[PDB]
């Protein structure tokens, strides 16, 4: 009766490897979003109306 | 009666490898989104109306 | 009675390898979305009306 229960991985980010030698960036930003990098987001549950989950480089401008 | 239960991987991101030598970027952004990088998003559940999940380089402008 | 239960992988992204030598980018963006990079999104469930899941380089402008 071994492992009668779970042995799982839910919403998992592992063994992410990155090797970026050079980024000679002249980044000019005027009222905007720029994303230059490793972004790991692991979630199990997100709920709600109008909800944003794991947004990267986002620009939200509502005339509401 | 081994492994009578689960041994699973649900919503998993693993063994992602990246090797980017050079990006001599002259990034000019005026009121917008730019994304230059590794983005790993692992989720199990997202719910709700009007919900955004795992958005990357997003621009939302509503006249509502 | 081995493996009477699951041994599965649901919504999985693995063994993604990328080797990008050079991108001498002159990226000019005016009120828009640009995406230059590795994007791995693994999900099990997304629900709701009007919901956006795993959007990349998105521009949403509604006159509603």
Per the listing, tokens 């992988």 go with: C9
Between A and B, how many CB-CB pairs are < 8 A? 252
Burial class (CB in 10 A: 0-12, 13-18, 19+), B14: buried
How far away is chain C from the Cα of B24, in angstroms, using its nearest Cα? Answer: 5
| Contact (Cβ atoms closer than 8 angstroms) between residue C23 and residue A21 | no
Helix or strand run (H / E) with residue B59: strand B56-60
Q: How determined?
A: cryo-EM
List strands edge to edge, sheet with B56-60.
A56-60, B56-60, C56-60
Nearest neighbour of B9 by CB, restricted to A9, A33, A43: A9
Burial class (CB in 10 A: 0-12, 13-18, 19+), A48: middle
Compute the distance between CA of residue B47 and CA of residue A46 in angstroms, rounded to an integer: 6
Compute the distance between CA of residue B56 and CA of residue C32 in angstroms, rounded to an integer: 12
Strands (E), chain C: 9-22, 28-30, 33-35, 39-42, 45-46, 52-53, 56-60
Residues of A in contact with C44 (CB under 8 A): 10
Strands (E), chain A: 9-22, 28-30, 33-35, 39-42, 45-46, 52-53, 56-60
Compute the distance between CA of residue B39 and CA of residue B36 in angstroms, rounded to an integer: 9
Q: Which of A35, C39, C46, A40 is nearest to B53 (CA)?
A: C46
What residues does B30 pair with on adjacent strands?
A30, C30
Per the listing, tokens 């709701």 go with: C48
In order of A28, B48, C23, the CA distances from A45 in angstroms are: 36, 11, 36
């Amino acid at each position: 009766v071994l492992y009668v229960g779970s042995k799982t991985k839910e919403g998992v980010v592992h063994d992410v490897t990155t090797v970026a030698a050079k980024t000679k960036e002249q980044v000019t930003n005027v009222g905007g979003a720029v994303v230059t990098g490793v972004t790991a987001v692991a979630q199990k549950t997100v709920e709600g109306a109008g909800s944003i989950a794991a947004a990267t480089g986002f620009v939200k401008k509502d005339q509401l």
